[PDB]
Design a protein around this motif. Structure first.
Motif, PDB file in Angstrom:
ATOM      1  N   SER A 132       0.859  -1.205   0.000  1.00 15.50           N
ATOM      2  CA  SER A 132       0.000   0.000   0.000  1.00 15.50           C
ATOM      3  C   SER A 132       0.886   1.243   0.000  1.00 15.50           C
ATOM      4  N   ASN A 133       0.343   2.338  -0.513  1.00 19.63           N
ATOM      5  CA  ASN A 133       0.984   3.672  -0.479  1.00 19.63           C
ATOM      6  C   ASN A 133       0.100   4.564   0.385  1.00 19.63           C
ATOM      7  N   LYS A 134       0.430   4.615   1.673  1.00 15.73           N
ATOM      8  CA  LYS A 134      -0.268   5.425   2.699  1.00 15.73           C
ATOM      9  C   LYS A 134       0.192   6.876   2.617  1.00 15.73           C
ATOM     10  N   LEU A 135       1.242   7.181   1.861  1.00 14.73           N
ATOM     11  CA  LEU A 135       1.617   8.583   1.554  1.00 14.73           C
ATOM     12  C   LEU A 135       0.800   9.076   0.362  1.00 14.73           C
ATOM     13  N   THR A 136      -0.229   9.859   0.635  1.00 17.85           N
ATOM     14  CA  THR A 136      -1.265  10.230  -0.349  1.00 17.85           C
ATOM     15  C   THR A 136      -1.133  11.711  -0.680  1.00 17.85           C
ATOM     16  N   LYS A 137      -0.858  12.007  -1.945  1.00 17.17           N
ATOM     17  CA  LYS A 137      -0.737  13.376  -2.509  1.00 17.17           C
ATOM     18  C   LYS A 137      -2.034  14.141  -2.238  1.00 17.17           C
ATOM     19  N   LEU A 138      -1.951  15.386  -1.783  1.00 12.57           N
ATOM     20  CA  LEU A 138      -3.118  16.298  -1.743  1.00 12.57           C
ATOM     21  C   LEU A 138      -2.887  17.392  -2.778  1.00 12.57           C
ATOM     22  N   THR A 139      -1.720  18.032  -2.721  1.00 17.10           N
ATOM     23  CA  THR A 139      -1.191  18.958  -3.752  1.00 17.10           C
ATOM     24  C   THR A 139       0.235  18.537  -4.101  1.00 17.10           C
ATOM     25  N   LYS A 140       0.865  19.248  -5.038  1.00 14.37           N
ATOM     26  CA  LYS A 140       2.258  18.999  -5.500  1.00 14.37           C
ATOM     27  C   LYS A 140       3.152  18.682  -4.298  1.00 14.37           C
ATOM     28  N   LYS A 141       3.101  19.532  -3.257  1.00 12.61           N
ATOM     29  CA  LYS A 141       4.033  19.513  -2.095  1.00 12.61           C
ATOM     30  C   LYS A 141       3.283  19.429  -0.760  1.00 12.61           C
ATOM     31  N   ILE A 142       2.069  18.898  -0.728  1.00 12.56           N
ATOM     32  CA  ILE A 142       1.345  18.617   0.540  1.00 12.56           C
ATOM     33  C   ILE A 142       0.805  17.199   0.441  1.00 12.56           C
ATOM     34  N   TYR A 143       1.357  16.289   1.220  1.00  7.34           N
ATOM     35  CA  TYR A 143       0.883  14.896   1.286  1.00  7.34           C
ATOM     36  C   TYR A 143       0.196  14.710   2.628  1.00  7.34           C
ATOM     37  N   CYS A 144      -0.591  13.650   2.746  1.00  8.20           N
ATOM     38  CA  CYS A 144      -1.038  13.124   4.052  1.00  8.20           C
ATOM     39  C   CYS A 144      -0.534  11.699   4.208  1.00  8.20           C
ATOM     40  N   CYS A 145      -0.364  11.253   5.443  1.00  6.46           N
ATOM     41  CA  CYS A 145      -0.162   9.825   5.776  1.00  6.46           C
ATOM     42  C   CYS A 145      -1.452   9.327   6.406  1.00  6.46           C
ATOM     43  N   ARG A 146      -1.928   8.188   5.935  1.00  7.33           N
ATOM     44  CA  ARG A 146      -3.268   7.655   6.243  1.00  7.33           C
ATOM     45  C   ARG A 146      -3.095   6.445   7.155  1.00  7.33           C
ATOM     46  N   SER A 147      -3.681   6.529   8.339  1.00  3.98           N
ATOM     47  CA  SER A 147      -3.833   5.403   9.280  1.00  3.98           C
ATOM     48  C   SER A 147      -5.329   5.197   9.508  1.00  3.98           C
ATOM     49  N   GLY A 148      -5.718   3.996   9.929  1.00  5.85           N
ATOM     50  CA  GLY A 148      -7.125   3.621  10.150  1.00  5.85           C
ATOM     51  C   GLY A 148      -7.742   3.117   8.866  1.00  5.85           C
ATOM     52  N   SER A 149      -9.059   2.952   8.866  1.00  5.86           N
ATOM     53  CA  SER A 149      -9.873   2.493   7.714  1.00  5.86           C
ATOM     54  C   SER A 149      -9.309   3.068   6.419  1.00  5.86           C
ATOM     55  N   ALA A 150      -8.793   2.194   5.555  1.00  8.70           N
ATOM     56  CA  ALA A 150      -8.244   2.553   4.233  1.00  8.70           C
ATOM     57  C   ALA A 150      -9.343   3.238   3.426  1.00  8.70           C
ATOM     58  N   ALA A 151     -10.546   2.671   3.438  1.00  9.46           N
ATOM     59  CA  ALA A 151     -11.761   3.237   2.813  1.00  9.46           C
ATOM     60  C   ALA A 151     -11.947   4.703   3.217  1.00  9.46           C
ATOM     61  N   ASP A 152     -11.899   4.978   4.520  1.00  9.71           N
ATOM     62  CA  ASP A 152     -12.254   6.285   5.125  1.00  9.71           C
ATOM     63  C   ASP A 152     -11.181   7.317   4.789  1.00  9.71           C
ATOM     64  N   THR A 153      -9.914   6.955   4.898  1.00 12.18           N
ATOM     65  CA  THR A 153      -8.789   7.889   4.656  1.00 12.18           C
ATOM     66  C   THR A 153      -8.638   8.165   3.160  1.00 12.18           C
TER      67      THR A 153
END
Lengths: 229, 244
Positions: A31-52
């Motif tokens: 899995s890739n829990k490092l999820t792009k929001l913008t060019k230079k703003i990512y989030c890291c997702r923990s918990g329900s994969a569906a929800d994040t």
């Protein structure tokens, strides 16, 4: 799940394991829990994969619309605040420990933990997921702020490795991404080249003397490893 | 009675739509888009008579998405309104389908929105010709190719090789049509196509333009994002036009 984001001077390193588990079976190993929001703003997702994934896609879409209409770069604070609103609005419906982290030229590198309540705390470094609990003591002891970009990546990888060595729910690849004034550098450490694992640590080579041959002495020798001896 | 609501005249025409086309011309600004081998340009007359008006602020060209630029000709604030609808439509599409809205879809959806205001009474047509430009990925080989889609107040959507909208659009088309018999126009370099577009501008308004008095949008195969062309690069094209 183990996710963390530390700040260096210019920017931030997000780091994450790669395992989604349906309890005790690994559904996804990469899995890739490092999820792009913008060019230079990512989030890291923990918990329900569906929800994040659902939140990360919603917030990414709002940030893209926002960025188009203001005709300027998005601040990490903006991404964090949007993600907080959504993680708060739905705090009873979703299970979602988020870390928003990124670069903006105003505030440089910024890290925001948005844990399960929908709190948004701005931090020098943030830990998240089942594996976070292993790292708090690791950071307290070994983390020194004002690291180089390179040292932070090495440290973040060493961290994630220490978590996923002990957390059953974490494992696989260590994904990092550095977000700073320069083009984002993603990298993926495979488990066979991880900076730490218990399996390779010489501390844990000698086996516990649990088995023990039937002897005429209380002297513990070693494990019985042959029926002849 | 026919002329004030959105109903057919005896000769089967919607007068309020015919009049929104007049709104496109009224501001006296001309735009010219042109599609080359590997890029789209859109050139808009950018006249600020007021020395006290901040040039940077008054734009005909808007970004709809990173990969779709727009150029609105007509009531500036009606243009501004359609861009907001286009951005809404594009955001909404990216959320629903998880991919950037194709320019030909965006254009068609904007035509749908326009048509609605020609069929429902009491909504004014947006008195503006939207000119979307952008690359579009060919599904056969994956190659990007340049696209211009106009939408007019009637809802009529069309792809173009070149188009003009505004004050002297009939004269600027006549120039581009005369220049299409000589050259292929889709085999042209960005430089050659830019010169044709700027020369059509220059022919139609009947005066040599400064690089300041036009704003130029751009999407290329190399850089598919909608960029504003810097005044330096436009200055080179106007010197290149005035020579040949």
């Amino acid at each position: 799940t183990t996710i963390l984001a530390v700040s260096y001077n210019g920017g931030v390193v997000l780091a994450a394991d790669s395992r989604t588990s349906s309890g005790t079976y690994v559904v996804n190993r990469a899995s890739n829990k490092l999820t792009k929001l913008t060019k230079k703003i990512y989030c890291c997702r923990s918990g329900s994969a569906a929800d994040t994934q659902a939140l990360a896609e919603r917030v990414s879409n709002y940030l893209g619309s926002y960025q188009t209409d203001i005709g300027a770069g998005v601040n990490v604070a903006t991404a964090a605040n949007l993600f907080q609103k959504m993680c708060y609005m739905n705090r009873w419906n979703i299970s979602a420990g988020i870390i928003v982290a990124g670069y903006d030229p105003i505030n440089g590198g910024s890290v925001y933990s948005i844990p399960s309540g929908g709190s948004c705390v701005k931090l020098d470094y943030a830990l998240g997921g089942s594996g976070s609990i292993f790292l708090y003591s690791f950071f307290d002891a070994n983390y020194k702020p004002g690291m180089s970009k390179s040292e932070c990546v090495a440290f973040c990888q060493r961290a994630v490795a220490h978590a996923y060595s002990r957390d059953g729910s974490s494992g696989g690849l260590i994904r990092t991404i550095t977000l700073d004034a320069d083009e984002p550098e993603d990298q993926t450490i495979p488990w066979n080249r991880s900076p730490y694992c218990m399996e390779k640590d010489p501390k844990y080579v000698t086996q516990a003397t649990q088995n023990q041959p039937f002897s005429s002495s209380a002297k513990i020798t070693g494990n019985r490893m042959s029926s002849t001896g | 009675f026919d002329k004030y609501i959105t109903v057919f005249s005896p000769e089967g025409s919607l007068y309020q739509v015919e009049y929104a086309f007049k709104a496109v011309t009224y501001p006296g600004l001309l735009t010219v888009a042109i599609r080359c081998k590997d890029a789209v340009l859109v050139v808009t007359q950018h006249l600020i008579p007021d020395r006290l008006m901040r040039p940077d602020s008054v734009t005909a060209l808007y970004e709809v998405t990173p990969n779709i630029g727009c150029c609105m000709t007509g009531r500036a604030p009606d243009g501004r309104a359609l861009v907001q609808r286009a951005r809404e439509e594009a955001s909404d599409y990216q959320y629903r389908y998880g991919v950037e809205i194709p320019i030909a879809v965006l254009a068609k959806r904007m035509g749908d929105k326009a048509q609605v205001r020609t069929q429902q009474a009491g909504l004014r047509p947006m008195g503006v010709v939207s000119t979307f430009i952008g690359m579009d990925q060919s599904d056969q080989d994956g190659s990007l190719k340049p696209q211009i889609y106009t939408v007019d107040p009637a809802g009529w959507t069309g792809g173009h090789i070149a188009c003009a909208a505004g004050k002297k659009q009939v004269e600027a088309m006549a120039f581009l049509e005369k220049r299409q018999k000589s050259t292929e126009l889709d085999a042209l370099t960005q430089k050659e196509a830019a010169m044709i577009a700027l020369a059509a501008l220059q022919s139609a308004i009947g005066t040599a333009v400064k690089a300041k008095e036009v704003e130029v949008g751009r999407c290329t195969a190399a850089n598919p994002a909608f960029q504003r062309v810097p005044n330096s690069e436009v200055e080179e094209w106007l010197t290149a036009v005035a020579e040949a």
